[PDB]
Every structure is written in C-alpha cells, then in structure tokens.
Design a protein around this ligand. Structure first.
Ligand SMILES: [Ca+2]
Length: 197
C-alpha cells in the first residue's frame, strides 16, 4: 500500500530495505513537500553499506534518500523527485542500478562528500542535472553513468566545480540535453557508445 512517511526510515549499516515495489510518500508537515524549499528531511536514511531496493517514491517526495557512506540503490523509482532524489552526505560510494527518476526541478543526485556514484541502467526524464557535486567544493567525486537513458535535461548530465572530479558517460541514450558534462578540467571526462536522439 502507499505509506505516508512521517519520520525518516533508518536502514542500519549493511542492511537492506525492500519496499517490495510499494510506494512511499512524505508527510509534507514533518519531512517536506518536494518543492525547492531548503533542507527538507529524507524519506530514507541509509547508513554505511545499507541498501534500499524495490521502492517507489511518490510525490510529495521531500528530500528523498540520504546515504551516510556506501549505499546500493536497486530498482528504486522516484516518480517525482522532490528537493533532491538521493544525496551522499558522507564519503562513500553510491551504486544505482535500474529504476527511474522523473520531474526533478533541479538535481536528481547531489554529492556532498568526496566519493563515487555509479548509475547503471537508469531512466531519467525532465530533470535539471543527473549529478551535481555540491557547489563550489573542490574535493574529488568520481561520477559514472552506464547504459542509461536520460532526457529533457535543463542543464547538464554531470556537473562539478572541482578540478579533480571525473565524469564518465558510457553507452547511454540521451535527448534534449544541453551538455553531457559541466565544470570538469580537460582530460577529466570520458565518453563512448552514446546516442543522441
Ligand atoms: Ca519534482
């Protein structure tokens, strides 16, 4: 059944939360409405090495998923991204495979610590950017996109301000995307097997 989430669901270190394909929305009074209003609460808080899987986040999506360290996100669908889809709050590696993200006013993925994010076999439509490293920071984030299909991007698929962050987009279909990468020093971008459509 759709659950209205009132308080953030914590997923302890190394554990999985399987939503079994069920929908989870935020309570707008306790977590946030999914607007651009700053610092809304995550619907899911993942501890290091935790996994979230087979979950549908519906609107109001507040500030989606935060990961404190490594997290694997498998077949999770953001039907309408709130403030952000998933944020990396502490250093680590985010791995996404499968799922989808729609209607993100600005970013789907926000990386707020040094780390990696691999996004595989993901559908994302009508978004500002797929991954933004927190603005101005100069720590290294490795951004990697494989076998995705990304469309109607306001700004860029991958965006950074750090001269050590790397961006890799491989075998991805994309449409109405202004730039693939934005802000990387020359030599810090890789791309192959992509298709503009
Ligand atoms: Ca939205």
């Amino acid at each position: 059944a759709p659950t209205v989430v009132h308080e953030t669901i914590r997923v302890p270190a190394g554990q999985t939360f399987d939503g079994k394909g069920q929908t989870y929305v935020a309570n707008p009074n306790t977590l946030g409405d999914g607007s651009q209003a700053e610092n809304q609460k995550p619907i899911f808080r993942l501890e290091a090495g935790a996994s979230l899987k087979n979950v549908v986040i519906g609107a109001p999506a507040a500030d989606g998923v935060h990961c404190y360290g490594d997290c694997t996100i498998t077949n999770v669908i953001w039907e309408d991204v709130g403030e952000d889809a998933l944020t990396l709050k502490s250093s680590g590696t985010v791995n996404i495979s499968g799922g989808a993200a729609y209607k993100a006013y600005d970013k789907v993925f926000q990386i707020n610590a040094a780390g990696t994010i691999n996004i595989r076999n993901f559908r994302a439509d009508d978004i500002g950017k797929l991954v933004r490293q927190n603005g101005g920071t100069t720590y290294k984030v490795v951004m990697n996109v494989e076998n995705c299909n990304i469309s109607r991007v306001k700004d860029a698929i991958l965006r950074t301000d750090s001269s050590t962050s790397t961006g890799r987009i491989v075998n991805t279909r994309y449409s109405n995307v202004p730039t693939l990468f934005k802000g990387f020093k020359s030599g810090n971008t890789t791309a192959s097997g992509n298709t503009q459509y």
